[PDB]
Amino acid sequence: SEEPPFDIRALRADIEDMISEKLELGPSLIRLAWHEAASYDCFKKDGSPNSASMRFKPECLYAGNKGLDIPRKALETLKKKYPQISYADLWVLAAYVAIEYMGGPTIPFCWGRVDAKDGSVCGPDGRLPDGSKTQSHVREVFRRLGFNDQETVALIGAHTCGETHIEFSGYHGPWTHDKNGFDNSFFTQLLDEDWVLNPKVEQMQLMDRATTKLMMLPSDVCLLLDPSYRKYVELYAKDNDRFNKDFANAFKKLTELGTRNLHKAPA
Ligand code: HEM
Ligand SMILES: [Ca+2]
Ligand SMILES: [K+]
């Protein structure tokens, strides 16, 4: 353990406090950190993941990043108050806090990420997964990130919390009945419901027959269609502890892609 130069105890507490005043914020912090890592290509070794390069054009304007200005701006306050933290570390830390606050795992945090200085390091568009595409696309994107199928499914389970917004993705609604709880219920809703066409959302999405108030994207239900992905959907649906543990491991790996010289924070 190595004590960071910013007051991490106070800062964790401030993040929890922000999240408690604005509930919809917790999940967006997770989506922020994920999208900042998802630009990586492990074959080309570029894309500048975990560097807060999304603060810059062109990356901030990519369609996949629509709406992430909100968590970005919410975190600005905290950057002013703890100027020693890099934006990159801040985004990651916020998401870790978000996850634990919502009843998810406690991910061991490493600090020391260097912020991108300008948009020239940004990778191309077309790196973020598209909700309308299915398993061959999802596998292509995650293999480009460096993940196997197991880590892929665990990661997508973050859809346990939060919701889609028409104004951001063009999709509408939450995946689960408690969008502020972090657990395996994304995998439970995925197997236990009958997913029918939602006939009134312009961008094709499914709804649960039982209530019609839950949704799934084509990229979510593709996990059931692909026999390798389905395997891990079943794994996590039937064992919440295993999902907690695999998610924590995959998320930490993810928010550590393309980083170097990090220090272990105290718990
Ligand atoms: C197959 C890959 C994925 C696709 C296609 C996808 C797609 C989407 C879409 C379309 C939204 C709605 C955005 C909005 O309207 O605000 C969303 C939200 C979200 N995503 Fe994903 N996602 C993927 C994987 C992931 C992963 C790996 C994570 C994190 C580990 C993640 C975390 C989240 C969270 C927490 C939200 C809710 C955001 C909020 O309430 O503001 N997603 N995702
Ligand atoms: Ca990035
Ligand atoms: K949930």
Query: Which among 25, 29, 34, 256 is the best mutation to test ligand 1's pocket, defined by most ligand atoms within 8 Å of the CB?
Result: 34
Give residue ranges with CB within 6 A of ligand 1: 24, 27-28, 30-31, 34, 67, 129-131, 138, 155-156, 158-159, 161-165, 168-169, 171, 217, 219, 251
DSSP string, 189-239: HHHHS-EEE-TT-SS--EEETTTS--EE-HHHHHHHHSHHHHHHHHHHHS-
Task: Compute the distance between CA of residue 160 and CA of residue 105 in angstroms, rounded to an integer.
Answer: 13
Distance CA 257, CA 155 (A): 14
Q: What would be the CATH architecture of the domain defined by 1-128+251-267?
A: Orthogonal Bundle (1.10)
Residue tagged active-site, from 91, 111, 175, 195: 175
Please report, in range form, the residues annotated as the binding site for Mg(2+): 36, 53, 59
The rounded Å distance from CA 53 to ligand 1 centre is: 19
Task: Identify the residue whose C-alpha is closest to ligand 1 atom 24.
Answer: 156
Strand partners, 163: 174
d(CA 103, CA 101): 5
- 122 Cβ contact list (under 8 Å, min separation 6): 39, 47, 48, 53, 56, 57, 58, 59, 116
Residue 80 CA, ligand 2 centroid: distance in Å: 22
Nearest to 35 by CA among 81, 112, 88, 86: 88
- Asked if 131 and 219 touch (Cβ cutoff 8 Å), the reply is yes
Supply the DSSP symbol for 85.
S
DSSP 173-186: EESSS-TT--STHH
Whether domain 129-250 has CATH 3.40.50.300: the reply is: no
167-187 burial code (b ≥16 CB/10 A, e <16): ebbbbbbbbbeebbebbbbbb
Q: 67 Cβ partners below 8 Å, 6+ apart?
A: 28, 165, 167, 168, 169
Active site residue 35: yes
Give pairs for 147-153: CB < 8 Å, separation 24+: 147/250, 147/253, 147/254, 149/228, 149/229, 149/231, 149/232, 150/232, 150/246, 151/246, 151/249, 151/250, 151/253, 152/229, 152/232, 153/223, 153/229, 153/232, 153/233, 153/235, 153/236
- Residue ranges, comma separated, of all CATH 1.10.520.10 domains in the chain are 1-128+251-267
- Across the chain, the runs of DSSP E, i.e. the strands, are 110-111, 163-164, 173-174, 195-197, 206-208, 215-216, 263-264
Q: Where in the chain is the domain with CATH 1.10.420.10?
A: 129-250
Q: Name the residue type at position 220.
A: D
Pick from 236, 234, 237, 238: which is nearest to 226 by CA? 234
